Amino acid sequence: EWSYHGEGNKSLVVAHAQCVVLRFLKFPPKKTSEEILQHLQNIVDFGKNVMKDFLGENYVHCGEVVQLPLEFVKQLCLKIQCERPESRCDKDLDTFSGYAMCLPNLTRLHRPILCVEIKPKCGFIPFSNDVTHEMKHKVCRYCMHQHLKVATGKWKKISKYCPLDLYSGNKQRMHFALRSLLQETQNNLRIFKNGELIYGCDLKELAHHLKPFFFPSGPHCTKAVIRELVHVITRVLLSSSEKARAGALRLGLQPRVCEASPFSSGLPKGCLLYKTLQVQMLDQLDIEGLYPLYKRVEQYLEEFPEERKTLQIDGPYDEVFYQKLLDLSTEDDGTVAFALTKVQQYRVAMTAKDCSIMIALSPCPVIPSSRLAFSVSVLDLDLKPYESIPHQYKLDSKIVNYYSKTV
């Protein structure tokens, strides 16, 4: 009755054939049942108390936490193991707790429905005066990283996608980047049709499944069937129902073009990319940067460990947590309070930098112009842990220093 639907390293999704999925956690071969509730509960809290503000009520969809029979979680886990990539069989499924989270299936909701999930990654190159390496002001994080992934053997080759192409307003750049994602999908593009993964774990094999959409006789080459996708997706990304209202974060745009991008005024105010980009800007300092402040908070919390709970570090992510994030002032007064605020803003921006966007297309409310009804949603919105900020500091040095070798 349930089927594998995809995963990352934090969670696993399985779809109901008869329109809801289930997000299951995944640990190695260690936590308690009490612990796992709070974690999942915080993700719900965070979503509706923080992200629902930053990205709008209809973009962020959440569903409540559920409890299920423990034998039933054992009886699904064994079936799935053949479906899961060998890469992600390092970590096992959350089988013991019996808890899971139920999100509505965006792929499903007679209706032929095409779905494009993107993991756009970071849309800006850092501007902060904390950055010690020169190359970080010229090249984006994504483009530098790509090197170390291919040298590691995570992916077979370099991607020509730069996120700044996609996060720029320009349709010609946005098309190029979308073309570049289709050539090297990696974990940045997946395409679904009627609840089924049809692309990014053959350019011409895609056109077989997409011909019935954009041309419902003939004759249309793959070049045509692919170009409509690129154009439709670009229009839906430049779509907005809120060109007027003032956002929560009014962070000013500060570089517009990456040096590494092989290609050749701004994003619409209400569009999901623009709202996603603002949340990412909360990293006003760099990690270089934010890490000194992390240690300032850390040494305080080690002096006073009961403070970790009372200062809402790992929860609750409630209406007061939200309001603390609003203080944009960047000039350091040497306090814990200042250092703590920036640590929480970074974690939030860190979560906006790893999130996926789900674009649904179906004919048939709202339309790019037969004329295709569309919805736009955002995913992977659970807060990055406080504890992982040192890992991000160390990883930042490695990407830059290795890429700097390659010049």
Ligand X SMILES: O=P(O)(O)O[C@H]1[C@H](OP(=O)(O)O)[C@@H](OP(=O)(O)O)[C@H](OP(=O)(O)O)[C@@H](OP(=O)(O)O)[C@H]1OP(=O)(O)O
> 261 near 164, Cβ under 8 Å?
yes
Nearest residue (beta carbon) to ligand X: 8
143 binds, among ligand X, Zn ion, none (CB under 5 to 8 A by kind): Zn ion
By beta-carbon proximity to Zn ion, the closer residue of 6 and 163 is 163
Q: How far apart are CA 357 and CA 379, in angstroms?
A: 6
Q: Residues touching Zn ion: how many (CB under 5 A)? A: 6
Contact positions vs ligand X (CB under 6 A):
8-10, 145, 187, 350, 354, 380, 384, 388, 392, 395
Taken as a whole, the chain contains a residue count of 407
**Closest distance to Zn ion from the beta carbon of 152 (Å):** 19
Question: Of 282, 281, 271, 283, which is closest to residue 378 (Cα–Cα)?
Answer: 271
The first and second tokens of residue 92, run together, are 């096992």
Residue (150 or 367) nearer to ligand X, CB: 150
Q: What does 206 interact with, of Zn ion, ligand X, none (CB < 5 to 8 A by kind)? A: none
Give CA–CA dist 210/4, Å, rounded: 23
Residue with tokens 């019935």: 212
Q: Which of 122, 191, 206, 258 binds Zn ion (CB under 5 A)?
A: 258
* Span interacting with Zn ion, options 2-10, 44-52, 158-166, 397-405, rule CB under 5 A: 158-166
236 lines the binding site for Zn ion (CB under 5 A) = no
* Tokens read off for 394: 């160390």
CB atoms < 10 A from the CB of 242, how many? 13
CB of 381 to ligand X, least distance (A): 10
Closest approach of Zn ion to the CB of residue 174, in Å? 14
Question: CA distances (Å), 208 to each of 214, 215, 220, in order?
Answer: 11, 11, 11
357 binds, among Zn ion, ligand X, none (CB under 5 to 8 A by kind): none
Q: Which residues pair with 395 in a beta bridge?
A: none
Return the number of the residue (342 or 384) whose C-beta is nearest ligand X.
Answer: 384
Cβ proximity of 74 and 82 under 8 Å: no
Residue, CB closest to Zn ion: 162
Residue closer to ligand X by CB (options 95, 392) is 392
Structure tokens belonging to residue 168: 């720029």
Q: For residue 190, what is the enclosing H or E element?
A: strand 189-193
Nearer to Zn ion, 148 or 301 (CB): 148
Q: C-alpha angle 275/133/332, rounded to 5°?
A: 60
Q: Which of residues 138-157 bind Zn ion (CB under 5 A)?
A: 140, 143
- Those residues whose C-beta lies under 8 Å from the C-beta of residue 322, and which sit 6 or more positions away, are 49, 50, 53
First to last CA, the chain: 52
Query: Closest CB to ligand X among 201 and 221?
Result: 201
Query: Least distance from C-beta 261 to Zn ion, angstroms?
Result: 5
What residue 140 binds from Zn ion, ligand X, none (CB within 5 to 8 A, per partner kind)? Zn ion
Nearer to ligand X, 118 or 207 (CB): 118
Long-range contacts of 210-219 (CB under 8 A, 24+ apart): 210/114, 212/112, 213/112, 213/114, 213/361, 213/372, 216/363, 216/370
Q: How far is the CB of 132 from Zn ion (least distance, A)?
A: 20
Measured from the CB atom, the residue of 140 and 233 that comes closer to Zn ion is 140
Closer to ligand X at the Cβ: 185 or 187?
187
How many whole angstroms separate alpha carbon 403 and alpha carbon 407? Answer: 6
Q: Which does 350 bind (CB under 5 to 8 A by kind): ligand X, Zn ion, none?
A: ligand X
Q: How far is CA 105 from the centre of its chain?
A: 17
Q: Is 125 in the site for Zn ion (CB under 5 A)?
A: no
9 binds, among Zn ion, ligand X, none (CB under 5 to 8 A by kind): ligand X
**Rule CB under 5 A: which residues touch Zn ion?**
140, 143, 162, 258, 260-261
